[PDB]
Design a binder for these strands. Structure first.
Lengths: 133, 118, 186, 73, 103, 125, 52, 152
RNA sequence: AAACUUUCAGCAACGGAUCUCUUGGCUCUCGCAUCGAUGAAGAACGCAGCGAAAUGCGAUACGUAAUGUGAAUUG
RNA sequence: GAGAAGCUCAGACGAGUAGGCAGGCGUGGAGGUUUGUGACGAAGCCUUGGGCGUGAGCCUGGGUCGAACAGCCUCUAGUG
RNA sequence: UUUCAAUGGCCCGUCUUGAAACACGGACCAAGGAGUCUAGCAUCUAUGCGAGUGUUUGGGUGAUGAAAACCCAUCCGCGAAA
RNA sequence: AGCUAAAUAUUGGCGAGAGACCGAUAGCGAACAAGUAGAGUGAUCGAAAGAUGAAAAGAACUUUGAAAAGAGAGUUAAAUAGUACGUGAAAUUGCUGAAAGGGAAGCAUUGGAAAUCAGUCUUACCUGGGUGAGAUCAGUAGUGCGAGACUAUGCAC
């Protein structure tokens, strides 16, 4: 009846988190909070996949790990999403923590590299600006 | 995004647009029964053809190897967090100067190049 | 200059269904993999028929399924029947035998009668689960020319086809040109 | 809808798909199905045989209620 | 001229048919007006029944003689057999049909 | 959301009624809120404006200007208040019209009709 | 333009009921609500049923 | 008001203008072209000479069918005329510009006509009657004239 | 080399396109039934402190009686 | 993984009136969506600057301007 | 972008076997400007149901606020027999 | 020989509610003193024409001019809003600047000359490494049973 493939078929070309631009031959972006790669693909879409990973910018410093909980909570959106916050420590520690909580657990082995890259980008955006006046 | 080569740089101006002001420069396919341009006689203007199509790898790329992605707000700028080495932010013309300052600051923080900064 | 004849260059077959049914797209997605990764021609036939239009997928009745699977020289006792289309019910068949039928869709009466008669109804994905290569499956299709358009197609002199009339009876294309008493006959 | 019509694709083409020689003048072969015995005979006799003529006897004031008799097998 | 497949055209539009076009954009309005009218009639005649009692008759053709429908009014013979005068039947809401007879 | 079939939400009709209303309707249209103290005293949220009314401007350039309503220009939906003027080229004073909704009444011009209107609206005197 | 243009479109009652049933089933899917733009991140349960 | 150009010191220049002046636009243009760039006093002397037919205004652009005189050899042409109405309008405007310069306190010894321009004012329409009952336009061509004088 | 002509640009002209509005039009729906010899519809002539048009009015003339609101009309 | 409507490898071919088909660009209005743009300046307009697309066209810098306007998925037409 | 130099380049649309034609229309610019809607028919496609199919001729929730959405019975149209 | 409500019609009149309609060459001919101006003997024919500004605050006063007007001034957020008024295209025109021109001009390809525009890379991650302070890291180890993962806490200082 309702499956991940069915959900993707419904929302592939029409959903809130999809930004579609006819420029450059029809490019697309995915803004789902649980989509780390940023691409509009079913494998990378957090709205469908039971196990999904996302990386957001923590305030005022750090990153936030978004992990989908057990599929039995699919009908309970309040408990469906899990939030993890890292301390103000080294980027190497943050990448190691992300890899341990994503890959070494067997949750999403294909998303560890992109999750680390997104965390690196967020931290490299959060670092203080060397204003050359 | 390396060795970007354009087959043709001319804009394919419409026939007789240089002679008549009521005829715009936007290309129109000539469909006259005695159209020398349509028949492609020597010395006449060239018509756009599929062969003029640029390489798919270098298509839509600016001379710096990037693609000018239009952004209207900080949320639009955040879309290029991961695609920093392929897309460059272009601030929309209707964005106010107050919001443009925030857009520039966010693009600088994310490392995204701005095509029309300042 | 090259002198090459181009007659059968662009293929006239369907590579994908014209419909936007998401569930039909999922079935096509499954059977694309099946036909590509298996050497069985049954999977290729199912994939090709999944693209076909409604007029190219005529319905078949349970009575027709029973008649085809109960032939003396058939040896079809308890194997599955496969139809890429709709299975309708034939009320003239008062007693429905036990049949295993896989179809794209069933009518409510046909499904109820099949279930009551001890048979089973499966979809195409269930059929792929049971018989991935279509082994021991009776593949059938409905009568394509049973449509009303084919009794008019090919109309002409001495073709014995149905004309396009707005009514029926005399005073409607039953005069000169249709009998010897009025000039000529057909 | 209008945006899917062939008229949109014919914009910029002078003859609008009707030809430069024969054009799209008003009725050039008559109105309706007139001429079925003179200049439309090659179409009438080929696709609508039996159109012209009388066959059968008339029945004045036919009423179908006494003739109502649907059948069942 | 006729050169395409299909039945020959039979359109009856050789008059000024465009000046006698009947649209139905007032269909919901007419439905509401009729409902309001019958509600007003029900209120004004309460507690009398909205619809008067009608007889059961057989339609007059072989196509419909196997059915039973509602008639116009009860015959004089029926009223006499039931013990109701023709003058009092109208007062108490029993329609009287002087044309129908009981064969 | 309006529900009455006698109420029109048409912008065209609403503008026509507003800009074509006669003087009697325009009197009700040109209403000003009462001050906080007047609200407690009279239990009335607002009243139509009138001459000899003490008001203070709440909006516009002349904010915080106290004065008494000298005239009511219903044709232009304006109030001419005392000492609210601007200098012309030659040095004369041209009064500045203020919308009724932009001023708040601080002292009513009490009379028989005004008191009867307050009592009719259900307010203490 | 004429008034007798076909303003109204007729759809089979079965097709209408099919569409309504599909819409109800879609409303019961939390992912489709988020895709349509409803802020249901903190909703306790989908479908959301409240007391009488 | 806005003038066509002013690439000079605003404190050492004076301006004058006239709108909808019922004088020939073509004649005014020729007078303006002739008097452009000369000093104010010499311009006044030249305008007086044109009044007295001692000097003529050359016609360089609108010279179709203009007669020839010996007074055009000063400017190197053959076609020259004496537009009295245009000269008087220019004389009045130059006098107004001189008055403005006097009010500004500028040095009235190095005053040179730095800018002068004539534009076509909206045409006033009249009717002329032709053969076979025809009515035809009889329009006028008034001029907008602006003059700027400045120190040399 | 000037003048002249042509092309472009900047200002100044001619002209009123584009954009945005709209007490207007068009269409649909709902409700109602009321002209006149007790002088209708229409026409003419007049009526205001300063009034030709429109609105209103008729020598009681931008109107009187009566009722309602309650400080204005406005150039 | 690569918007499976995706990714990848290889070969051949390319004139075109009348005409046929497909995919796209642009305009007005409607539904949904984009903590969408905007008096710290929307639309429009000018431009001797820049960028993209084979092209229909689009984005942008600089001026003028003053109040509304747009991207995406569909619907629709008095749409070039 | 302008201009120069070399080479090439006839005025567009239209009827036509054939137009640069000594064939016709066109001085210039702005705005407007021409396969639309309806009653049918034929093919193809999509959807729903299926020996059935078609709720909107009509009636009810109706009063709310309801030209909508939703529900409801007998006929009837087409098909099931020529 | 005759009467009779209801269900039915309604591009006229009156009142009301709306619109996937038109946004001033559109929509009624008429958004504006429109069946008005105007034409014809007459029957009849029949237009064009909306927008300053929030508010006239509609430019006091001086000076030149016979005057119209101009220049100074002044109001306003704006006079690049002055009633010839929202913005203000094109055709066409004037001045200025640049360039070219021996009975056409315009265009296409290539390049020269002149003018003009962008490319800020040596941001950022990281190897080596001089000065510098610092709640000190993995390995350990204690804290839902085996085991991979991690927050917090004492040793490791």
């Amino acid at each position: 009846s309702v499956s991940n493939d069915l959900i993707w078929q419904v929302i592939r070309d029409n959903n809130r988190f999809l930004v579609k631009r006819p420029e450059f031959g029809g490019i697309q972006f995915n803004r789902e909070p649980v989509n780390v790669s940023g691409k509009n693909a079913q494998r990378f879409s957090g709205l469908c996949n039971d196990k999904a990973v996302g990386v957001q910018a923590n305030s005022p410093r750090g990153v936030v790990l978004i992990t989908k909980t057990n599929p039995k909570n699919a009908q309970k959106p309040a408990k469906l999403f899990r939030k993890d916050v890292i301390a103000n420590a080294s980027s190497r520690k943050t990448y190691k923590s992300i890899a341990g909580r994503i890959g070494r657990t067997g949750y999403r082995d294909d998303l560890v590299k992109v999750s680390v890259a997104r965390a690196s980008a967020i931290l490299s955006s959060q670092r203080p600006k060397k204003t050359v006046a | 995004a390396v060795n970007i080569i354009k087959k043709r740089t001319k804009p394919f101006k419409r026939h007789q647009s240089d002679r008549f002001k009521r005829v715009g420069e936007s290309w129109r396919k000539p469909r006259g029964i005695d159209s020398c341009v349509r028949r492609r006689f020597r010395g006449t203007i060239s018509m756009p053809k599929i062969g003029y199509g640029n390489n798919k790898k270098t298509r839509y790329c600016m001379p710096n190897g990037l693609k000018a992605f239009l952004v209207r707000n900080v949320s639009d700028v955040e879309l290029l967090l991961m695609h920093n080495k392929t897309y460059a932010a272009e601030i929309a013309g209707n964005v106010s100067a107050r919001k443009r300052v925030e857009i520039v600051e966010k693009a600088r923080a994310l490392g995204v190049k701005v095509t029309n900064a300042g | 200059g090259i002198d090459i004849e181009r007659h059968h260059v662009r293929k006239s077959q369907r590579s994908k269904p014209a419909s936007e049914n998401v569930y039909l797209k999922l079935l096509v997605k499954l059977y694309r993999f099946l036909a590509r990764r298996t050497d069985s021609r049954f999977n290729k036939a199912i994939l090709k028929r999944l693209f076909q239009s409604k007029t190219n997928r005529p319905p078949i009745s349970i009575s027709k399924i029973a008649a085809l699977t109960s032939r003396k020289s058939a040896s079809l006792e308890g194997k599955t029947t496969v139809i890429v289309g709709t299975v309708t019910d034939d009320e003239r068949l008062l007693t429905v035998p036990k049949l295993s039928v896989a179809a794209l869709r069933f009518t409510k009466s046909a499904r109820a009668r099949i279930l009551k008669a001890g048979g089973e109804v499966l979809t195409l994905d269930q059929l792929a689960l049971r018989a991935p290569t279509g082994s021991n499956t009776v593949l059938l299709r409905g009568k394509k020319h049973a449509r009303e358009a084919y009794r008019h197609f090919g109309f002409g002199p001495h073709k014995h086809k149905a004309p396009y009339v707005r009514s029926e009876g005399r005073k409607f294309e039953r005069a000169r040109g249709r009998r010897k008493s009025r000039a000529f006959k057909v | 809808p209008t945006h899917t019509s062939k008229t949109r694709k014919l914009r910029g083409h002078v003859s609008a798909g009707h030809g430069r020689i024969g054009k799209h003048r008003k009725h050039p072969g008559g109105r309706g199905k007139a001429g079925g015995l003179q200049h439309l005979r090659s179409h009438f006799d080929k696709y609508h045989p039996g159109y012209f003529g009388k066959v059968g006897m008339r029945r004045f004031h036919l009423m179908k209620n006494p003739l109502w008799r649907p059948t069942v097998n | 001229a006729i050169h395409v497949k299909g039945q020959l055209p039979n359109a009856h539009f050789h008059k000024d048919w465009q000046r006698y076009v009947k649209t139905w954009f007032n269909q919901p309005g007419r439905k509401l007006r009729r409902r309001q009218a019958r509600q007003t009639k029900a209120a004004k005649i309460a507690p009398r029944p909205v619809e008067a009692i009608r007889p059961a008759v057989k339609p007059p053709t072989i196509r419909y003689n196997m059915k039973v429908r509602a008639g116009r009014g009860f015959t004089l013979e029926e009223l006499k057999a039931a013990g109701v005068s023709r003058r009092v039947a109208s007062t108490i809401g029993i329609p009287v049909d002087h044309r129908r007879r009981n064969r | 959301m309006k529900f009455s079939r006698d109420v029109t939400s048409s912008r065209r009709k609403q503008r026509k009624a507003h800009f074509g209303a006669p003087s009697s309707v325009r009197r009700v249209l040109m209403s000003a809120p009462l001050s906080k103290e007047l609200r407690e005293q009279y239990k009335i949220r607002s009243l139509p404006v009138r001459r000899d009314d003490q008001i203070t401007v709440i909006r516009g350039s002349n904010k915080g200007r106290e004065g008494k309503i000298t005239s009511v220009y219903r044709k232009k939906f304006l109030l001419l208040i005392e000492r609210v003027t601007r200098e012309k080229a030659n040095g004369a004073s041209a009064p500045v019209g203020i919308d009724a909704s932009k001023v708040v009444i601080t002292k009513l011009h009490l009379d028989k009709d005004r008191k009867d209107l307050i009592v009719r609206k259900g307010g203490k005197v | 333009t004429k008034t007798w243009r076909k303003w109204h479109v007729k759809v089979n009652q079965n097709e209408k009921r099919y569409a309504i049933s599909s819409a109800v089933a879609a409303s019961g899917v939390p992912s489709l609500l988020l895709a349509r733009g409803h802020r249901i991140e903190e909703i306790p349960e989908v479908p959301l049923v409240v007391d009488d | 008001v806005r003038y066509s150009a002013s690439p000079a010191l605003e404190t050492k220049c004076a301006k004058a203008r006239g709108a909808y002046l019922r004088t020939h636009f073509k004649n005014s243009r020729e007078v303006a072209f002739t008097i452009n760039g000369m000093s104010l006093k010499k311009a006044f002397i030249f305008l007086d000479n044109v009044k007295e037919h001692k000097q003529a205004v050359p016609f360089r652009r609108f010279n179709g069918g203009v007669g020839r005189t010996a007074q055009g050899k000063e400017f190197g042409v053959t076609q020259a005329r004496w537009p009295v109405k245009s000269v008087k309008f220019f004389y009045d405007l130059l006098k107004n510009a001189e008055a403005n310069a006097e009010a500004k306190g500028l040095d009235m010894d190095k005053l040179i006509i730095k800018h002068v321009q004539v534009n076509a004012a909206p045409k006033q329409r009249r009717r002329t009657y032709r053969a076979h009952g025809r009515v035809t336009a009889y329009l006028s061509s008034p001029s907008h004239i602006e003059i700027i004088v400045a120190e040399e």
